[PDB]
Ligand binder design. Structure first.
Ligand SMILES: NC(=O)C1CCOCC1
Lengths: 300, 237
């Protein structure tokens, strides 16, 4: 189990760690988060009490270094940093733990939610979507735009998700216009899986990362990416059977975790109705269809 | 975006643009089978592709053999339309290619957009106008070439005959849409109007009769009456 200490908490803030969250008061003696499960990526995220505008946060993996949070009063945010002095860090953490100034990552033993949301998410792939090579962790916020959004404006601050566009030469073989548009299997299997992602694990990892950025930061371009990656599978007549079974599990846990009150903005009516009720895969997502029908029957 | 009454004179500017109407591409007769079920028999159809500025009509005849062994023909027909329009554009010299293609039915947008991906600068537009191009097969010479075709064929016409020698393209399009609207609402009566007087003939190289300016005013008035009539006979007014 690993630890992310905080130098201090000078401004009142709601702090998230994965799917958990807690409020910290201005100048409260808070010094970080302990007992963080090893083996998974994590996200530590922030919403200031005085400006709910800009949720922001950091994706990290404690196996890759010792990370801590420190507020910067000039840039006005909580920043993640890496401590290279391992003995300084161990000594800092042990003092804060002895003084019990840390919250414990509050995982229930039965509970596989975080694993199920991050199964295919890898830090190395996150770092190619979010380019800032000098840090081992990745900053994301509510306002960052995607490469695709920019084609339609600061490149260094963009989310470089894989561009999916159903009315593009990449998606449509000359001479197979109707075939490729009505059955996207070529685009899914040859262009994207074989060509770009290399395997379905990397495809699912990007899909899961897009969902989590949509949910945790309200990142609109991330929501667009998540739905496009679902639609590309559902609109393909030929999909490996293991991929459909895994997709049903992925989406089930995403829909289960989504705040009931954000469904209006985080779920695209057209995509979900098409995917569950009209697409080639309308009968292949049993778990997802059941949870959607019982939790969000209005959308459908 | 969409073409409507607000931006109507844009049709008559010097930028090349084509209307595409697909309503006569897939045509069938519905009939009973010996067992008393229902079946369809396709008949030849046509794509109606027209330049409203010049009057040039590219009539691509769709022979029934193109449907043999195919499923979901009404869907296929939209894709076949877009394939043929794309082929027409590629066949034209660059300086004759359109800068916009306006489809008369919104279901043609995605098929045409996908087939024209190679032409990103050609705008594919819908329209809010309710244009009467379905009535093209009420023009006897057009219906005749479609029904006689034994294979796929493209035939080129000028739908305005020689009218542009005397009138503008705005007025010519208004006359054409009035004639076609009339033929659509009451084909028998419309055709009676157009030919009632045997001394006015259709030249071999024309589609419509050789009316003088004054006779066109009479004809046009008769077509408006017909359309208003039928509109009463319809709604009882
Ligand atoms: N808009 C057109 O199709 C023409 C008008 C003038 O002659 C060349 C182009």
């Amino acid at each position: 189990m690993n630890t992310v200490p905080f130098t201090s908490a000078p401004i009142e803030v709601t702090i998230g760690i994965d799917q958990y969250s807690f409020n910290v008061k201005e100048n409260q003696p808070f010094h970080g988060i302990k007992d963080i499960p090893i083996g998974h990526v994590h996200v530590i995220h922030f919403q200031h009490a005085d400006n709910s505008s800009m949720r922001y946060g950091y994706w990290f993996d404690c196996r890759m270094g010792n990370f801590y949070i420190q507020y910067d009063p000039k840039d006005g945010l909580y920043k993640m940093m890496e401590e290279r002095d391992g003995a300084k860090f161990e000594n800092i953490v042990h003092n804060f733990k002895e003084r019990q100034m840390m919250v414990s990552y509050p995982k229930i033993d039965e509970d596989d939610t975080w694993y199920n949301l991050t199964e295919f998410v890898q830090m190395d792939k996150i770092r190619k979507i979010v380019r800032k090579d000098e840090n081992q962790f990745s900053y994301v916020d509510s306002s960052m735009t995607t490469v695709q959004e920019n084609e339609l404006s600061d490149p260094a601050h963009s989310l470089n998700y894989t561009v999916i566009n159903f009315k593009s030469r990449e998606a449509i073989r000359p001479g197979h216009e109707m075939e490729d548009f009505l059955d996207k299997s070529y685009y899914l299997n040859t262009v994207m899986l074989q060509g770009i992602f290399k395997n379905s694990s990397n495809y699912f990892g990007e899909l899961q990362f897009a969902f989590l950025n949509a949910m945790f930061f309200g990142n609109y371009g991330s929501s667009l990416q998540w739905h496009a990656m679902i639609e590309l599978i559902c609109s393909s007549a030929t999909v490996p059977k293991h991929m459909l079974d895994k997709l049903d599990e992925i989406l089930y846990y995403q829909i289960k975790t989504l705040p009931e009150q954000y469904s209006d903005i985080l779920l695209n009516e057209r995509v979900w109705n098409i995917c569950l009720y009209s697409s080639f895969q309308k009968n292949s997502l049993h778990n997802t269809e059941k949870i959607m029908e019982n939790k969000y029957p209005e959308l459908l | 975006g969409a073409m409507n009454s607000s931006n109507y004179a844009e049709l008559f500017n010097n930028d090349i643009k084509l209307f595409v109407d697909d309503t006569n591409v897939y045509r069938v007769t519905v009939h009973k089978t010996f067992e008393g079920n229902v079946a369809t028999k396709a008949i030849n159809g046509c794509i109606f592709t027209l330049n409203p500025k010049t009057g040039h009509l590219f009539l691509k005849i769709i022979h029934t053999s193109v449907w043999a062994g195919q499923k979901r023909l009404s869907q296929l027909a939209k894709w076949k339309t877009a394939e043929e329009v794309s082929a027409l554009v590629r066949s034209l010299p660059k300086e004759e290619q359109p800068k916009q293609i306006i489809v008369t039915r919104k279901a043609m947008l995605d098929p045409l957009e996908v087939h024209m991906l190679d032409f990103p600068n050609i705008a594919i537009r819908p329209t809010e106008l309710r244009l009467p191009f379905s009535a093209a097969m009420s023009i006897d010479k057009l219906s005749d070439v479609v029904m006689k075709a034994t294979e796929p064929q493209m035939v080129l016409f000028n739908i305005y005959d020689d009218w542009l020698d005397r009138i503008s393209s705005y007025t010519a399009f208004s006359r054409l849409t009035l004639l076609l609207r009339a033929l659509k609402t009451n084909e028998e009566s419309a055709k009676m109007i157009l030919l009632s007087d045997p001394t006015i003939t259709i030249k071999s190289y024309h589609l419509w009769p050789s009316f003088t300016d004054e006779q066109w005013i009479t004809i046009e008035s008769q077509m408006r009456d017909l359309i208003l009539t039928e509109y009463g006979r319809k709604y009882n007014v």
